[PDB]
Amino acid sequence: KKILIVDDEKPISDIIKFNMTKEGYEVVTAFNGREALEQFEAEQPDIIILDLMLPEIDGLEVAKTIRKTSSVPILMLSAKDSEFDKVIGLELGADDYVTKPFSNRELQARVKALLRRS
Ligand code: BEF
Numbered sequence: 001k002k003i004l005i006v007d008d009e010k011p012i013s014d015i016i017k018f019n020m021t022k023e024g025y026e027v028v029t030a031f032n033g034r035e036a037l038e039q040f041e042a043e044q045p046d047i048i049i050l051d052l053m054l055p056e057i058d059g060l061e062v063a064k065t066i067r068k069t070s071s072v073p074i075l076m077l078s079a080k081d082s083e084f085d086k087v088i089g090l091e092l093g094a095d096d097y098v099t100k101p102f103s104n105r106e107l108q109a110r111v112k113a114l115l116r117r118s
């Protein structure tokens, strides 16, 4: 399975990539919202892990745009942890929303759960 990891912070992207590589997934990365949409179109990932505070296009906009044409599972991963943040992310099309800092093991389990019901 292929996972697109969207995060502008390289250290965070690297940690998620390492953990997804350990699960046997193929990993593709994007460091801003524009790169996220370009990688989504070129790579057709099975699941997207999506940061929200991104340069060029924010994660909420990326999710809304992707949802116009695809039902690909989206797991938002952000430091934005308010009730409004989680509700808006889910209402715009996210299948899950995990807050930073996060557990690598829980992330793996949620990606598995999402792939299970998608
Ligand atoms: F910058 Be991500 F929204 F944590």
Ligand SMILES: [Mn+2]
Pocket (backbone or CB within 6 Å): 007, 008, 009, 051, 052, 053, 054
């Ligand atoms: Mn960010």
